[PDB]
């Protein structure tokens, strides 16, 4: 039983990290800034450590419901750090080749991409005891190198005369987890996703 307590076996678990329902007739898509700070259950597992080095295995699961279910084609373009995120459903950045788009359907098995380790440094600073900006307006606890990127998902199809809600569940499973410098488990509840405020 000493092998289930491996940090590989402790953290590599495809937990839900993003869930947003967008209508179709953010305007009719959604972008999700890839952080581990979204849900309180995976965050407290990852706030057990200080430095993490993991490849995320993002599995985009798209459901659909009207108001016959249509068979759509979706795009799940991953906008990395530095590249620009789309502001519209039909913007030019969806056509950008150098971003890692993946084209899938609702009726397919869920799309699955392995986002690599994309920090500038050798590990993700889960807790950063510093400041990003070089002035005093820079936010605390935000490493400039911690940014995974942006997962931008739209419907490739044109406008259809049916109005229908598209709910997208994004499942992240960290891979090849190397973890450094364990921390105490956080006992008090969270107050924001940006910082470690307590009540």
């Amino acid at each position: 039983g000493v092998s289930e307590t491996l940090v590989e076996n402790f953290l590599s678990r495809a937990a839900l990290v993003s869930k947003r329902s967008f209508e179709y007739k953010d305007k009719n898509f959604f972008k999700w800034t890839i952080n581990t700070r979204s849900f309180v259950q995976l965050r407290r597992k990852l706030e057990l450590f200080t430095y993490l080095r993991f490849d995320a295995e993002i599995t985009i699961l798209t459901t659909v419901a009207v108001n016959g279910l249509p068979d759509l084609t979706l795009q799940a373009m991953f906008v990395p750090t530095g590249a620009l995120t789309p502001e519209k459903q039909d913007s030019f950045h969806w056509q950008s080749g150098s971003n890692a788009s993946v084209f899938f359907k609702i009726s397919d098995p869920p799309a699955r991409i392995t986002i690599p380790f994309m920090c500038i440094n050798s590990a993700y600073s889960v807790f950063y005891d510093g400041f990003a900006g070089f002035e005093k307006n820079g936010l605390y606890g935000i490493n400039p190198a911690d940014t995974i990127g942006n997962l931008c998902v739209r419907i490739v199809n044109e406008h259809q005369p049916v109005g229908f809600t598209v709910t997208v569940r994004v499942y992240m499973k960290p891979k090849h987890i190397k973890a450094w410098a364990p921390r105490p488990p956080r006992t008090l509840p969270y107050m924001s996703i940006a910082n470690a405020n307590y009540k």
Binding site: F127, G141, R183, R186, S192
Partner: protein, 218 residues
């Protein structure tokens, strides 16, 4: 005796190699006798109702001496630390200090959604004070804070604690003016007590930056 550079400490009453790592150089300029010295901070008045003290590193040493010059003139730093905390009590004082060195101690404010500012984090030589030391001021638990490198100053047994911090970063070199790797956190778990006086046992913190590297001189 702890003599590094010109500053010496004739300490008169046990290393904690933090995460088992002795600080070495990067496999940059290397000030070996200019900065590798005990920048003894001000001794803190430890009363009974004291909550704790925190010194973020190298924020505690950005204004002090040759290391303080080489922060405000260079751009990156790579340096382990050697913190010698000594809490000189008699045989009639009681208490227990968790002298714990917390890496990447991202603090949290109490009862607000606003992040802590530059003023609430980068204190310097004066150091800080735990507003809620039971939760380390980051929502975690003091009870589990021994997962970090730490030594106990139990005034029954010892008055000193020596923690040897390595280079603790994902990056090879980082900002001294913006980023603070470690945080020497001295928290009195068992408070000070003696009946005849509401006494003070001053806690001397001496932080010697081991194996300094620097780059980017302007």
């Amino acid at each position: 005796q702890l003599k590094l550079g010109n500053s010496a400490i004739v300490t008169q009453e046990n290393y904690c190699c933090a995460y088992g790592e002795w600080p070495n150089y990067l496999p940059p300029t290397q000030p070996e006798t200019a900065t590798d010295r005990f920048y003894t901070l001000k001794s803190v008045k430890w009363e009974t109702g004291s909550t704790g003290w925190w010194w973020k590193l190298p924020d505690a040493l950005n204004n002090i001496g040759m290391f303080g010059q080489n922060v405000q003139h260079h751009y990156l730093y790579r340096s382990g630390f050697l913190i010698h905390v000594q809490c000189n009590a008699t045989k009639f004082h009681q208490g227990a200090l968790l002298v714990v060195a917390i890496p990447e101690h991202q603090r949290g404010a109490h009862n607000t959604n606003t992040s802590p500012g530059f003023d609430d984090i980068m204190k310097g030589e004066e150091g800080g004070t735990f507003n809620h030391p039971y939760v380390l001021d980051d929502g975690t638990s003091l009870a589990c804070a021994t997962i970090f490198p730490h030594q106990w100053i139990n005034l029954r047994t010892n008055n000193s604690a020596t923690i040897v911090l390595p280079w603790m970063n994902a990056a090879p070199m980082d900002f001294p003016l913006r980023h603070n790797q470690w945080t020497l956190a001295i928290i009195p778990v068992v408070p000070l007590g003696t009946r005849t006086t509401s006494s003070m046992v001053p806690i001397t913190v001496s932080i010697a930056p081991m194996c300094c590297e620097f780059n980017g001189l302007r």
